[PDB]
Design a protein around this ligand. Structure first.
Ligand SMILES: O=C(O)[C@H]1O[C@@H](Oc2ccc([N+](=O)[O-])cc2)[C@H](O)[C@@H](O)[C@@H]1O[C@H]1O[C@H](CO)[C@@H](O[C@@H]2O[C@@H](C(=O)O)[C@@H](O[C@H]3O[C@H](CO)[C@@H](O[C@@H]4O[C@H](C(=O)O)[C@@H](O[C@H]5O[C@H](CO)[C@@H](O)[C@H](O)[C@H]5NS(=O)(=O)O)[C@H](O)[C@H]4O)[C@H](O)[C@H]3NS(=O)(=O)O)[C@H](O)[C@H]2OS(=O)(=O)O)[C@H](O)[C@H]1NS(=O)(=O)O
Ligand SMILES: OC[C@H]1O[C@H](O[C@H]2[C@H](O)[C@@H](O)[C@@H](O[C@H]3[C@H](O)[C@@H](O)[C@@H](O[C@H]4[C@H](O)[C@@H](O)[C@@H](O)O[C@@H]4CO)O[C@@H]3CO)O[C@@H]2CO)[C@H](O)[C@@H](O)[C@@H]1O
Ligand SMILES: Nc1ncnc2c1ncn2[C@@H]1O[C@H](COP(=O)(O)O)[C@@H](OP(=O)(O)O)[C@H]1O
Ligand SMILES: [Cl-]
Ligand SMILES: [Cl-]
Ligand code: NA
Ligand code: NA
Ligand code: NA
Length: 670
């Protein structure tokens, strides 16, 4: 981001040419250039790039996305004088308040309305229920009743919410992120109606924004559902249209989710005062807003003075009617998870590939960020025969507390013949009784015989050869921000692990495949900024990479497939390999780790594990924005760890409960 310039991001369905005009006036008056851009998926890109030193100075989106940005420290708190604040409506400022702080400037209120072609349909239907009959009439004329975007849940939500669907329950002054309303009876009734429209061929599951707009603007369908921004192209096509209240469902209003177009200032911007000047004194004026509105209409604007000027527009009146009947969107971080969940559910139910009940049950789980596991997932019972051919293999991922855990395995297990750990000697002899055969494959027993910090791909391909059995793989995992910081500090004091083989498909990577991040013999002294800056840093997503079958993505050759392909493959492989291991622990839960290992393998340790809170990672003072950047660099790990933590904790609860019940039964007998 350059100082003395403004870069602005706004979505491509908005009046960006109009905004650019406002930017030109600001430039005329101040010599400061303003660059407007409308990148695809700007709302996903922003938290990926703003976490670094890049991104726009100002980002425009509906307010629902901004709580997540603010929680991640990506937005500047906005500091409008009371005088300015009074120029906008208070309920629009509420839309942009997060944890008590104002995090953006509200611009305009948007709600979906029913838009109809007066040359085909002079009185629009008042109910969803009459649409099928109406369609039958229109089909005999070679037309259809209704087409709208079925791919974005924004557009189907009004019908789903009408009879009772909700996102997150509001109770006791906040949104309850565990109380999700996407699979209740009202939600199902709404979605069922939509799926029935499609089954009866009144709509097509494939219809998206472009298809619906093209049909309406060409006079092929009598109605569409859309927002104020859409009115411009309709006018361009010279359709004689009206904008009105959405149809009712089961006698109740459609309830659209109401968005407030908002402008946030990037926390990493060197131009915060200039962005403030632009927004308050150029955009949020009658003239600034008129420029944008004339390009693509904004809806009901937040600035009282200009809202009053336009209030007479019946299209805006309909917009306010629909907005009053709907709900303002939550701005909480969990909103994006809600939307992603419903998006998928609607597509799969609409297509007929999944029933409404199943699809919405899936959305329910996803929106609430829950994980469902089978009994089999929770039960890990190994009759570990140390006298037999059983072998435990410890896959040690760097900086997960593996030195501690590996020491426990060789020093701390009660066995008839425990590992022989000679004083002043790194490794131990962990042999079966009477034999010269090892029961433990690990750094402190057999050594790094399949390579330094051999990962899942290396071990599963090397261990069976180098030992000739039942192999019981185990590992430890750590929250990725802490693990990443620990690795940074260790590399900063000399660690390279440069002798690791990184074998996959029978060879090590080439230098082209895996470039080194440092010149010279190590990366000692590296700042966290420079650590984060190297694209080929093996610290990024280390736990996923080391748990996945890397052959599935062409090993270390990043040109073999795109990131959109490779990433879901890696995460799924890591999850599966982890889940299917005999056991794993978590660094943050030392006592539970001990207990589960003991109960899995029917072994006991001599001394209790202990929790060390004062780690080198914990001692790093971390700005939220930098924490966010570390999360983004480790996004696969973040997802793996969320999965792993929940499964680990469900395993703990399951095993403990079973054991408590067993004790009780024995007592009941006596
Ligand atoms: O045997 C020979 O061939 C010998 O021959 C001699 O010549 C003759 C001998 C005899 C006769 N005769 O007539 O009788 C004639 C001629 C010749 O002079 C020798 O050069 C030659 O020796 C060669 O072979 C031997 C045997 O293989 C080699 O010795 C082995 O390997 C040594 C070694 O590699 O240094 C040494 O191993 C011990 O020490 C290593 C280094 O500390 C240990 O490996 C390290 O483990 C670290 C760890 O786990 O902590 C790891 O650290 C990294 O990860 C951790 C955890 O994440 C982090 O904390 C660290 O920060 C991180 N550091 S990093 O970022 O820098 O990576 C290290 O990476 C890893 O290297 C090793 O475990 C340890 N093994 S031991 O405990 O068993 O001792 C030993 O001497 C020996 O090991 S072993 O075979 O017994 O297992 C010798 O190196 C080799 N010399 S060479 O010049 O040919 O290369
Ligand atoms: O990978 C699947 C898709 O993911 C991405 O779309 C996501 C967004 O990133 C989420 O934020 C969310 O989108 C919401 C949106 O936040 C909400 O404001 C509303 O968007 C309206 C908007 O307010 C209005 O001004 C106008 O622009 O129409 C928008 C609707 O199209 O509703 C959105 C949900 O429909 O969820 C979507 C997932 O549906 C990514 O951008 C997609 O390209 C990708 O396919
Ligand atoms: N019992 C324990 N409780 C908490 N953290 C522990 C631990 N034993 C080790 N760790 C942490 O695990 C990291 C070392 O992992 P490894 O042995 O795999 O390299 C260190 O993190 P820090 O570098 O942040 O201090 C260490 O503090
Ligand atoms: Cl070794
Ligand atoms: Cl614990
Ligand atoms: Na040795
Ligand atoms: Na160096
Ligand atoms: Na800290």
């Amino acid at each position: 981001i350059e100082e003395g310039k403004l870069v602005i991001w706004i979505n491509g369905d908005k009046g960006y040419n109009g905004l650019a005009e406002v930017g030109k006036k600001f430039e005329k008056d101040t010599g400061i250039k303003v660059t407007v851009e409308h990148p695809d998926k700007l709302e996903e890109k922003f938290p990926q790039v703003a976490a670094t030193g890049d991104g726009p100075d100002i980002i425009f989106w509906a307010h629902d996305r901004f709580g997540g940005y603010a929680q991640s420290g990506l937005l500047a708190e906005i500091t409008p004088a009371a005088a300015f604040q009074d120029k906008l409506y208070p309920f629009t400022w509420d839309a942009v308040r997060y944890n008590g702080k104002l995090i953006a400037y509200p611009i305009a209120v948007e709600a979906l309305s029913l838009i109809y072609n007066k040359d085909l349909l002079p009185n629009p239907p008042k109910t969803w229920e009459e649409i099928p009959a109406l369609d039958k009439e229109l089909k005999a004329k070679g037309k259809s009743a209704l087409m709208f975007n079925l791919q974005e849940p924004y557009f189907t939500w009004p019908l789903i919410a009408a009879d009772g669907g909700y996102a997150f329950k509001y109770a006791a002054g906040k949104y309850d992120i565990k109380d999700v309303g996407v699979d209740n009876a009202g939600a199902k009734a709404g979605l069922t109606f939509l799926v029935d429209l499609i089954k009866n061929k009144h709509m097509n599951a494939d219809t998206d924004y472009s298809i619906a707009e093209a049909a309406f603007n060409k006079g092929e369908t009598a109605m569409t559902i859309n927002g104020p921004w859409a009115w411009s192209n309709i006018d361009t096509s010279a359709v004689n249209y009206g904008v009105t209240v959405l149809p009712t469902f089961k006698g109740q209003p459609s309830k659209p989710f109401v968005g407030v177009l908002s402008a946030g200032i990037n926390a990493a911007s060197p131009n915060k005062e200039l962005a403030k000047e632009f927004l308050e004194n150029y955009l949020l004026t009658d003239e600034g807003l008129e420029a944008v509105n004339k390009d693509k209409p904004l809806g009901a604007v937040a600035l009282k003075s200009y809202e009053e000027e336009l209030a007479k527009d019946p299209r805006i009146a309909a917009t306010m009617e629909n907005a009053q009947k709907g709900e303002i969107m939550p701005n909480i971080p969990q909103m994006s998870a809600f939307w992603y969940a419903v998006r998928t559910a609607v597509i799969n139910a609409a297509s007929g590939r999944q029933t409404v009940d199943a699809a919405l049950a899936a959305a329910q789980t996803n929106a609430a960020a829950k994980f469902n596991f089978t009994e089999r997932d929770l039960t890990r019972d190994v009759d570990f025969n140390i006298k037999g051919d059983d072998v435990i293999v410890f896959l040690h991922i760097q900086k997960t507390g593996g030195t501690t855990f590996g020491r426990h395995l060789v020093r701390n297990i009660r066995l008839e013949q425990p590992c022989d750990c000679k004083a002043g000697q790194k490794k131990c002899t962990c042999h079966r009784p009477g034999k010269q055969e090892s029961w433990l494959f690990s750094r402190f027993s057999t050594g790094w015989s399949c390579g330094l910090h051999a990962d899942w791909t290396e071990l599963t391909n090397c261990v069976p050869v180098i030992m000739d059995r039942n192999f019981y793989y185990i590992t430890m995992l750590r929250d990725p921000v802490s693990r990443y910081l620990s690795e940074w500090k260790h590399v900063q004091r000399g660690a390279t692990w440069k002798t690791s083989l990184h074998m996959c498909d029978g060879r090590s990577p080439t230098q082209d495949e895996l470039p080194t991040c440092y010149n010279g013999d190590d990366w000692s002294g590296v700042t966290l900024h420079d650590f984060m800056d190297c694209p080929s840093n093996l610290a990024n997503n280390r736990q996923v990479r080391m748990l996945a079958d890397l052959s599935l993505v062409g090993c270390y050759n990043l040109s073999t497939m795109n990131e959109s392909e490779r990433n879901p493959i890696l995460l799924a492989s890591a999850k599966s390999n982890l889940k299917n291991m005999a056991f794993y622990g978590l660094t943050e839960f030392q006592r539970k780790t001990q207990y589960l290992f003991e109960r899995t393998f029917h072994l006991r340790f001599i001394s209790a594990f202990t929790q060390i809170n004062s780690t080198r990672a914990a001692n790093v003072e971390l700005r939220d924005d930098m924490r966010s950047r570390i999360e983004q660099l480790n996004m696969l790990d973040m997802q793996l760890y969320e999965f792993a933590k929940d499964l680990f904790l469900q395993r703990y609860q399951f095993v403990r409960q079973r054991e408590r019940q067993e004790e009780r039964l024995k007592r009941r007998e006596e």
